[PDB]
Amino acid sequence: RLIQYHQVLEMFILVLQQCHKENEDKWKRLSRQIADIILPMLAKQQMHIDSHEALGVLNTLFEILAPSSLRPVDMLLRSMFVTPNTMASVSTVQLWISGILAILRVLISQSTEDIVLSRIQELSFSPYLISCTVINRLRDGDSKNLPEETFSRFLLQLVGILLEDIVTKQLKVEMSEQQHTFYCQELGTLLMCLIHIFKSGMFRRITAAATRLFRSDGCGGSFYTLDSLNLRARSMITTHPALVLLWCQILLLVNHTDYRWWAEVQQTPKKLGMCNRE
Amino acid sequence: TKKDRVNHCLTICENIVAQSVRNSPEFQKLLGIAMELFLLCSDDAESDVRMVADECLNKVIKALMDSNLPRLQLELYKEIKKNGAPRSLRAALWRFAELAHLVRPQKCRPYLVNLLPCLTRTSKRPEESVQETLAAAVPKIMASFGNFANDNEIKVLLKAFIANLKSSSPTIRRTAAGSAVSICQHSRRTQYFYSWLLNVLLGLLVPVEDEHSTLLILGVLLTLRYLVPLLQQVSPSAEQLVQVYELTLHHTQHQDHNVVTGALELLQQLFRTPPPELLQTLTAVGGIGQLCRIKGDIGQSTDDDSAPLVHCVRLLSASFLLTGGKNVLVPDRDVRVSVKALALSCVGAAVALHPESFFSKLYKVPLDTTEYPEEQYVSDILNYIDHGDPQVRGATAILCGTLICSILSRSRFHV
């Protein structure tokens, strides 16, 4: 009844860890009972996971759950490929992206690439789930293809949303300093997940799809282009050098070696200066 | 003879603090003489025959605090309910407020019910020292008893204090403002009562184009200055907060400089601790439109093409700080240094939210260029960096610091 709070999630990690040793069939049953509650809540942004601590507790709970409870990833995928009821408020965007990050870490740490891509193929989520137009509608107001392409376009649209919210958002009008800190921590977790996906070698199909998308264009403005993301990242140099370096690592992981980005963040030649730029 | 009155009103305080025979009826009604006497030595015609009274009241209280607290509480509530002499009332009231937090949460409802009449009564008391003691006693009493009132009782106390907001005494107006805000704050339904008091105060000045006294205006502006800090996220809405901002902007134009000072202090508290929705309205370009002479058109807070803070800064500058020529400072005879310092502080607090306002031309539609050669800029308030009195040079320094920080924060150092 109180599961939407991360302190209750800690109490459940304990309950689960002890029922694991008491009996491994009370364990799996309770793990199923918990996943079946949590995943729809994450889909609808009802969990209070708008903090670093709460997201970490959710991660370790997902790790403590019995694997059988998340074995068919149809539910994880249905609970991840969602849009929020609005993205005009910072808190809703943060809760939505936080639940997405939790489910995504689950997908890249407890499942394999082929299973996830097959299941995505069955339940045909579209890449246009969050297009630039859906994004711009949800920001103020409301209303075939390859599975790896859908997954990669989803993660890239998330990156673009997070960049736009970190760069173009006044620092105490719309969001507090804690909300800004969490936005940057969410972007860091997302970029680290992406680096693991492109660097580990266990997501070759997703990596190839992402390399194809990064070289693609704006389908009449339906998705974020690489130049748009890079223009947003170039403005984070003076404020968030760590996230910018993660973005550079991702650009190398997809072989974007254009000297429009590299000969400028490296200040390639032909007042003390800022330390973040250094 | 009075020396032995000091000796008696000190020896009763030498006896009861040391008997070890208490917790028995032989004590309570000797205490019923000690407290009724120490509170009588409190309204004495002689100075030190009252100071020994205060000292021994404090001794008897602090020595028997945990031992016989409820007895002392009743003994002080009685001399409050009596509505007696002023000095005795102050004594009993301030000593009862300092002990309110020691009442166990089963006697806060009887005590609140008994205290409501006494409080409404002593609010109608014309003495100024009584009003000071009440301004200090109302927050302490509410912070301990307000969770035990119903909304009707709280509204009774609130209407009891709203009346003093038109009083001619400044002490009485300040006590009213503070007591109303503190009553709203320490209530069960805090946000609803904040909105209720907002309704009452904005209703007290519904048409700004209508005579509203000078004393009522001062009282309402002070109450709003006290209430604005508490509005950091029914609940009060952008509608009435924007109406409060409009009221403040209108009353900075008043001809009485006390109303100008009150409105500048309200605008200061409103830019330094802005409710999160009024902030968004003031910084939004559409803004409110979507929901000492001026000499020219500076614009309207309802304009588009610019956020309302641009107009607010234009208003403050064109009113109290800039003539309209070029590097010409407004004399002190036209507007005093207090109003000038407060206007510079308000401009700094507004620039903290919206640096672009600092760079505006002083006038949207310029003054007639035949005689005024060059258009003045708001930024010329910086010429006050060498005004001549402190607190105006210091305010200009504060404004430069705030402006540097705000420009570096708005652009990502992409200055």
List CB contacts (< 8 A) between B413 and chain A.
238-239, 274
Residues in contact with B125: Cβ distance below 8 Å, sequence separation at least 6, in sequence order: B83, B86, B89, B131, B134
Sign, CA torsion A248/A249/A255/A259: positive
Contact B266, B259 (CB under 8 A): no
Q: Which chain A residue is nearest to residue B410, measuring alpha carbons?
A: A170
Check B413 against A239: CB less than 8 A apart.
yes
For residues B338-370, b (16+ Cβ closer than 10 Å) or e, as one string?
Answer: bbbbbbbbbbbbbbbbbbbbbebebbbeebeee
Identify the CA nearest to B179 among candidates B247, B215, B125.
Answer: B125
Nearest CB among A171, A236, A274 relative to B409 is that of A171
Beta-carbon neighbour count of residue B235 at 10 Å? Answer: 12
Amino acid at B153: E
Q: Which residues contact residue B387 at a Cβ distance below 8 angstroms, ignoring those fewer than 6 apart?
A: B329, B337, B340, B393, B396
How many helical (H) and strand (E) elements, i.e. helices and strands, does chain B have?
Answer: 17, 0
Tell me how far apart the alpha carbons of residues A82 and A62 are, in angstroms, rounded to a whole number.
Answer: 19
Closest-CA residue of chain A to B352:
A172
> Left, alpha or beta for B104 (phi > 0: left; psi -120 to 50: alpha)?
beta
Chain B residues close to A174, C-beta within 8 Å: 280
Quick one: closest CA in B to A167, which residue? B412
Q: How far is CA B300 from CA B78, B249, B310, B345, in A?
A: 56, 10, 10, 21
Cβ–Cβ contact B233 with A under 8 A: no
CA atoms within 13 A on the CB side of A187: 28
CB contact under 8 A, B279 and A171: no
Six-digit token pair at A218?
Answer: 């704006």
Question: Which residues share a beta bridge with B361?
Answer: B377
DSSP result, B278-290: HHHHHHSSSGGGG
Discontinuities in chain B with C to N beyond 2.5 Å fall right after 233, 291
CB A139 within 8 A of CB A112: no
CA angle, residues A127, A128, A130, in degrees to nearest 5: 100
Cβ–Cβ gap A238/B409 under 8 Å: no
Q: Flag whether residue B312 sits within 8 Å of chain A, measured between CB atoms.
A: no
- The answer to whether the Cβ–Cβ distance between B413 and A170 falls below 8 Å is no
CB–CB of A170 and B283 under 8 A?
yes
B343/B264 Cα distance (integer angstroms)? 7
Among A157, A146, A84, which residue's Cα sits nearest to residue A120? A146
DSSP line for B70-116: HHHHHHHHHHHHTT--HHHHHHHHHHHHTTGGGS-TTSHHHHHHHHH
DSSP per residue, B399-410: HHHHHHHHHHHH
Nearest to A235 among B283, B410, B412 (CB): B412
CA B268 to chain centre: 13
Instruction: Tell which of B283, B410, B413 to mutate to test the A interface (max A CBs under 10 Å).
Output: B413
Count of C-beta atoms within a 10 Å radius of residue B99 = 17
Distance between CA atoms of residues B225 and B270, nearest Å:
7
CB contact under 8 A, A173 and B413: no
Chain A contacts of B414, Cβ < 8 Å?
235, 238
- Judge whether B280 is closer than 8 Å to chain A, CB to CB: yes
Note whether B232 contacts A: Cβ–Cβ < 8 A: no
Which of B176, B319, B381, B346 is closest to B262 using CA atoms? B346
B353 at A interface, C-beta within 8 A: yes
Residue type, B88: S
Q: Kindly determine whether residue A173 and residue B283, on different chains, have CB atoms separated by under 8 Å.
A: yes
Q: Which of B283, B353, B412 sits opposite A239 (nearest CB)?
A: B412
Between CA B144 and CA B151, with CA B150 as vertex, the angle to 5 degrees is 110
CB < 8 Å to B282, chain A: none
CB B100 within 8 A of CB B144: yes
Q: Which of B161, B147, B149, B254 is nearest to B209 (CA)?
A: B254
Q: Do B279 and A235 touch (CB under 8 A)?
A: no
Kindly determine whether residue A238 and residue B353, on different chains, have CB atoms separated by under 8 Å.
no
Contacts of B409 in chain A (CB under 8 A): 171
Written as six digits, the tokens of B397 are: 């320094």
What amino acid is encoded at A100 in this protein?
I
Q: Which of A172, A174, A238 sits opposite B414 (nearest CB)?
A: A238
| Chain A residues with CB-CB distance to B283 below 8 A | 170, 173
Contacts with B412 from chain A: Cβ below 8 Å: 167, 235-236, 238-239
List residues in chain A touching B: CB distance below 8 A.
167, 170-174, 235-236, 238-239, 274
Any idea which residue has 């009370």 for tokens?
A26
Under an 8 A CB cutoff, do A236 and B412 touch?
A: yes
Find, in chain A, the residue whose alpha carbon is nearest to that of B409: A171
The one-letter amino acid at B165: L
Give B-chain residues touching A172 at CB under 8 angstroms.
Answer: 279
Interface with chain B: mutation pick from A173, A175, A177, A274, highest number of B CBs within 10 Å? A173
Provide the number of CB pairs (under 8 Å) joining chain A to chain B.
19
Q: Render the burial of B161-190: b for 16+ CB within 10 Å, e for the rest.
A: bbebbbbeeebbbbbbbbbbbbbbbbbeee
Cβ atoms of residues B299 and B314 within 8 Å? yes
Q: Is B412 on the interface with A (CB under 8 A)?
A: yes
Mutate to test the interface with B, among A170, A243, A264 (most CBs of B within 10 A): A170
Q: Take residue A129 and report the two structure tokens written for it.
A: 């789930």
Cβ neighbours around A122 below 10 Å, total: 10
Which residues lie closer than 8 Å to A17 by C-beta, 6 or more apart?
A64
A235/B414 touch (CB, cutoff 8 Å), yes or no? yes
Tell me how far the alpha carbon of residue A218 is from its chain's centroid. 21
Spatial separation of the C-alpha atoms in residues A220 and A159, rounded to whole Å: 19
* Structural contact between residues B350 and B357, judged by C-beta atoms closer than 8 angstroms: yes
Contact present, B403 and B355 (Cβ < 8 Å): yes
Contacts of B353 in chain A (CB under 8 A): 173
Contact between A170 and B410 using a beta-carbon 8 Å cutoff: yes
CA distance A104 to B3: 86
d(CA B84, CA B91): 11
Query: What are the phi and psi torsion angles at B377 (to 5°)?
Result: -110, 150
